[PDB]
């Protein structure tokens, strides 16, 4: 009987937005990047307004502010998709805890991610990388890099760290994908319960016959001392399993696409492997694949450079936009593997800064060196315009990456 007849411009754009190019900001995010001030209003999928943080130093300050809680079960935590309500209703790992509780659980896992342990993992990582490469190269002239290399490699590595038997990998890889990428709460809740039932059986097995890896250590020590609830152990292992899978696999696939679209830099990298760690840092900054890991809720009023975040408002620290802050990175939208990408926010900042960041850095270095060593002729088997990018409501990446090479 009547429709919207007036101009449709808004000062609270829909958020998140979808990438159209794997290594560029969505058009809407480039606009948010360009507007002065640390904060901007956005509209989430259900109509609720929230703040996004769009500048680098303010992103650090707010991630460091204990008044921005990580409690996903809070009624006002910003949900960016209906699938989030599964997370709001479900038990929480320490990614959803605040101090002091956050520290007591995170410290149960840190021993597996120390610089010294990551170093001792290089033989396993190199062996896993080159083994899946052996298989993919022998299996055809073309391949899907995602299912045949990008995903299995970090899956096997994190399963060894955790004590999760890789014999069950078809089951929990599928459940991990369904949980991270589901668009509705039912699909997400079902995938979470699938993983939870699997991990619960693993825990009882380790109570009968003590097991290897971090789940084995948690069952034998903290669980037996009542220091972690059985439900929390499940959530903790599940967080580590999924983060260990999906993040590195996405960085691998998107780095390959990005590097093949910048052949001069890829060639420089091939010619001087000492550049590989710096290139990994730049690709992390540039691809910034985890904006869904920026959500917070204010438990008190917070003044930010003349703007006010009110208690109970949702805040999303958008690290991809913050990593394109031209006051920190000159010419921020240019890929430069020679630049200083230090201080980037791809792993967050503060007490929740990525537990796995140095494992991810080790994996990505080994992977890039291996692809340059073993498949220097690697190229995409389809044009970039035929690839399909995941939406902005999940970890960025591609679900399929057809590639080919020289026989
Ligand atoms: C591959 C690139 C990766 C990226 C870009 C990434 C990104 C992030 C970000 C931005 C956060 C901060 C979340 C927040 O502030 O709420 C985070 C936390 C976390 N990440 Fe990573 N991650 C990566 C790899 C990994 C890996 C391999 C693991 C292995 C277990 C992992 C485990 C975790 C955990 C457990 C947390 C929660 C830390 C805490 O709450 O104290 N991540 N990650």
């Amino acid at each position: 009987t009547d429709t919207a007849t007036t101009p449709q411009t808004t000062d609270a754009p829909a958020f998140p937005s979808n990438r159209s190019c794997p290594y560029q900001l969505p058009d809407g995010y480039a606009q948010l990047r360009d507007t002065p001030g640390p904060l901007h209003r956005v509209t989430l999928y259900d109509g609720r307004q929230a703040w996004v943080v769009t500048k680098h130093e303010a992103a650090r300050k707010l991630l460091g502010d204990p008044r921005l809680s990580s409690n996903r079960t809070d009624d006002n935590f910003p949900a960016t998709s209906p699938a989030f309500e599964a997370v709001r209703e479900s038990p929480q790992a320490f990614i959803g805890l605040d101090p002091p509780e956050h520290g007591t659980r995170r410290r149960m896992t840190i021993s597996e991610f120390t610089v010294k342990r990551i170093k001792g993992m290089r033989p396993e990582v190199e062996e896993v990388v080159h083994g899946f490469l052996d298989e993919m190269l022998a299996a055809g002239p073309t391949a899907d890099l995602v299912s045949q290399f990008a995903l299995p490699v970090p899956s096997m590595v994190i399963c060894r760290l955790l004590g999760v038997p890789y014999a069950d990998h078809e089951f929990f890889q599928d459940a991990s994908k369904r949980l991270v990428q589901s668009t509705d709460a039912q699909s997400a809740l079902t995938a979470r319960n699938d993983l939870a039932g699997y991990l619960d059986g693993l825990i009882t097995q380790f109570q009968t016959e003590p097991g290897a890896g971090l789940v084995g250590a948690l069952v034998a020590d903290q669980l037996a001392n009542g220091e972690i609830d059985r439900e929390e152990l499940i959530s903790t292992a599940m967080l580590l399993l999924i983060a260990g899978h999906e993040t590195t696999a996405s960085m691998t696939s998107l780095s390959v696409i990005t590097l093949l679209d910048h052949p001069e830099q890829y060639a420089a990298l091939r010619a001087d492997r000492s550049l590989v760690p710096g290139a990994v840092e730049e690709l992390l900054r540039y691809l910034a694949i985890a904006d869904i890991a920026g959500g917070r809720v204010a438990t008190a009023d917070i003044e930010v450079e003349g703007q006010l975040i009110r208690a109970g408002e949702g805040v999303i620290v958008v690290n991809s936009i913050a990593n394109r802050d031209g006051t920190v990175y000159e010419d921020p939208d240019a890929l430069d593997i020679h630049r200083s990408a230090r201080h980037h926010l791809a792993f967050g900042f503060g007490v929740h800064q990525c537990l796995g960041q140095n494992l991810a850095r080790l994996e990505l270095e080994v992977i890039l060196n291996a692809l340059m060593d073993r498949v220097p002729t690697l190229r995409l088997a389809v044009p970039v315009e035929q690839l399909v990018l995941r939406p902005g409501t999940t970890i960025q990446g591609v679900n399929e990456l057809p590639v080919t090479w020289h026989h």
Side-chain angles (χ1 to χ4, degrees), residues 94-95 102 106 113 158 239-240 243-244 247-248 251 289-290 293 296 346-348 351-352 354-356 360:
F94 57 82
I95 195 167
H102 165 261
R106 175 174 170 128
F113 296 91
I158 197 72
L239 172 64
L240 295 169
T247 56
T248 298
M251 278 303 294
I289 60 163
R296 300 290 187 267
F347 293 123
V351 297
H352 292 280
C354 182
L355 178 71

Side-chain angles (χ1 to χ4, degrees), residues 311-373:
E313 290 197 283
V315 183
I316 301 183
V317 185
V318 185
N319 57 77
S320 63
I321 295 167
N323 283 349
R324 302 304 185 89
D325 189 332
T327 77
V328 186
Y329 308 104
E330 180 192 332
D331 304 298
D333 298 329
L335 181 72
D336 184 2
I337 59 166
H338 307 267
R339 84 162 66 240
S340 172
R342 302 180 61 68
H343 324 302
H344 70 72
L345 286 159
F347 293 123
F349 171 83
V351 297
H352 292 280
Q353 180 150 350
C354 182
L355 178 71
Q357 58 183 320
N358 292 323
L359 175 60
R361 288 174 168 117
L362 166 70
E363 291 168 332
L364 289 169
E365 167 266 307
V366 170
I367 284 164
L368 289 177
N369 273 314
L371 293 171
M372 291 186 293
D373 281 347

